């Protein structure tokens, strides 16, 4: 039990840090939370990796303010991997003064634990769509 | 072993596709855990009976051609995760508009004690094209 609980705590820690480093953009923190081989999937787009994700986040932050609220639905550990499900609601506010946009939907993630006990995002499927 | 497990997974994927091209409820049911959760864009998570019912109803209405390319298979027993690229062609039996969909699915499989690899969690991001 203790082991599972500690792993769940560490994974939730990654998820919360990820959210904070998106609301207030922090490239260095985000980069540290994902594996070098990370793959992201979103609907209507080809899979993309770490540098693509970070570049987009950075550019996006130049243009918009992001608010994000998560409702966590599950974490399952099968060490040294884990899989999660989360519901996300996102509000995007253009810095220019343009119209506010909202998106929502579920995201499924796979995390990997290193030999040093470090949990990181390895694979993500994000089904957030405009609402 | 790892190799046997990867083969078993590709086999499940092939059987799943075959049981969609020519609908077979029993084959599909046997390839999912009872607690399976499916995610698709714009829809609430749904489970095993919901998936089977939808497939069955779909099959009354349309013919499905499906194609898949496996991009990744990783085994961490008793789990595995995969990424696949899919193309689907939908042909209404009524002669209505043929449709195409494409995109990716990320899947998590669990090995049962009898050693059956079954789909446990799926995110299917296929969209109309």
Calculated CA dihedral for residues B3, B6, B7, B8, nearest 10 degrees:
120
**What does A14-44 look like in DSSP terms, one character per residue?**
HHHHHHHHHHTT-HHHHHHTEEEEEEEE-TT
Burial class of residue B101 in the structure, from the number of CB atoms within 10 Å of its CB (0-12 exposed, 13-18 middle, 19+ buried)? middle
Report yes or no: A12 at the B interface, CB cutoff 8 Å.
no
Contact in structure between B78 and B111 (CB atoms under 8 Å): yes
With beta carbons less than 8 A apart as the criterion, state whether A127 and A105 touch. Answer: yes
Closest CA to A23 of A55, A78, A70: A70
Among all residues of chain A, which has the CA nearest to that of B81? Answer: A110
The span from the CA of B112 to the CA of B109, in Å, is 10
CA–CA gap between residue B72 and residue B104 (Å, rounded): 11
- The total domain count for chain B is 1
User: What residues in B contact A44, CB-CB < 8 Å?
Assistant: 103, 125, 127
Contact call for A81 and B79, based on CB within 8 A: yes
Query: Which chain B residue has its CA at the smallest distance from A111's CA?
Result: B81
The answer to whether A35 contacts chain B (CB < 8 Å) is no
Best to test chain A binding among B121, B124, B127, B129 (most A CBs inside 10 Å): B121
Of A80, A105, A108, Cβ closest to residue B121: A108
Indicate the burial class of B61 (C-beta count within 10 angstroms; 0-12, 13-18, 19 or more): exposed
Return the ∠ at Cα A114 (arms to A108 and A120), rounded to 5°.
30
Residue A22: domain span? 1-131
Say which CATH number the domain at A3 has.
Answer: 3.10.450.50
Q: How far apart are CA B104 and CA B116, in angstroms?
A: 24
Name the experiment that determined this structure: X-ray
């Amino acid at each position: 039990g203790a082991g599972r609980h500690a792993d769940e705590l560490a994974i939730r820690t990654v998820q919360y840090r990820w959210l904070e480093a998106t609301r207030k953009f922090d490239r260095q923190v985000l980069s540290s939370l994902m594996t070098d081989d990370v793959v992201f999937l979103t609907p209507g787009r080809l899979p993309f990796g770490k540098e693509e994700f970070l570049a987009a986040c950075e550019q996006n932050d130049q243009r918009v303010i992001i608010e994000a609220s998560a409702t966590f639905e599950e974490i399952v550990i099968v060490e040294p991997m884990a899989y999660t499900r989360t519901h996300l609601h996102i509000k995007v506010t253009p810095r220019s003064g343009g119209a506010v946009r909202e998106l929502a939907g579920h995201a499924m993630s796979i995390f990997r634990r290193s030999m040093f006990g470090e949990w990181q995002l390895a694979r993500d499927a994000n089904l957030v769509v405009p609402i």
